Amino acid sequence: KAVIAIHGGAGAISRAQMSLQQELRYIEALSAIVETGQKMLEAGESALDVVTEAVRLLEECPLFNAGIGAVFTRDETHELDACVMDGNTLKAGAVAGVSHLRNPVLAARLVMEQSPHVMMIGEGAENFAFARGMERVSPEIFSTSLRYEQLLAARKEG
């Protein structure tokens, strides 16, 4: 009775404010990622590997506010956070406030497996991941003109 569920964010998704073409891109991205998870589960992949891979794909997808496509802070920066938890061991790994790691969920998993810690933040989390061969990236890689126009709209609001 193996099964997967995914989400890409809850909020004020208004029908009168969306285009059909946008809705179709979301449906396609969600269906492509959930099918990858189903196929891994069917092949006997661990629940930990499955959630790790699905979140990695949701990070990579610029439509969703995680990894590439992250929202901007007040200062036009990106600060990313992630967690993974293994229900079999109750082990967990998390990062918060990271700017120079392409895939937070993979860093979170590295904290779980290769540290005696559960949570790492900021430059300390980054240095820990870089020492174990994760690539250092520019936070400009996350930036999208859609989320930038959302930052301007939020500033006009107040």
Binding site: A5, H7, G11, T52, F64, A70, V71, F72, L80, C83
Partner: protein, 135 residues
């Protein structure tokens, strides 16, 4: 915010959550996403949970652990636990959003109190279902 929960063929539960936070966030602000029991929780004895919404309220209510505690100690089903957290407790604290949850019996729930939640689910070897809006 994005996330995933799964039950594998060996009966194991896992959850993962990732976010860029909120548009125009104060630098250094941390939401529920990386906090065990707030935005992400898994326990083979109970449930896997990944949350999305107003991070502050999900922390204050420990929403992801609250589902597990409601089932494990309260004897609530997944559906009843999800109802109580997402449609009663979080709105009462000014909280809006949703979560995805699978229990150790393979039940799945995608509750949300908002207009929309980008979401999908499927059983190993069945056809997937995707959703944006209510219904």
């Amino acid at each position: 915010t994005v996330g995933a929960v799964a039950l594998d063929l060996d009966g194991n539960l896992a959850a993962a959550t990732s976010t860029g936070g909120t548009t125009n966030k104060l630098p250094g602000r941390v939401g529920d996403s990386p906090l065990v029991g707030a935005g992400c929780y898994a326990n083979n004895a109970s449930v896997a949970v990944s949350c999305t919404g107003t991070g502050e309220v999900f922390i204050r209510a420990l929403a992801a652990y609250d589902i597990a505690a409601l089932m494990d100690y309260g004897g609530l089903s997944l559906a009843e636990a999800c109802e109580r957290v997402v449609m009663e407790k979080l709105p009462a604290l000014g909280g809006s959003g949703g979560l995805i949850a699978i229990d150790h019996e393979g039940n799945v729930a995608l509750p949300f109190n908002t207009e929309g939640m980008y979401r999908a689910w499927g059983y190993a070897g069945d056809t997937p279902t995707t959703g944006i809006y209510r219904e």
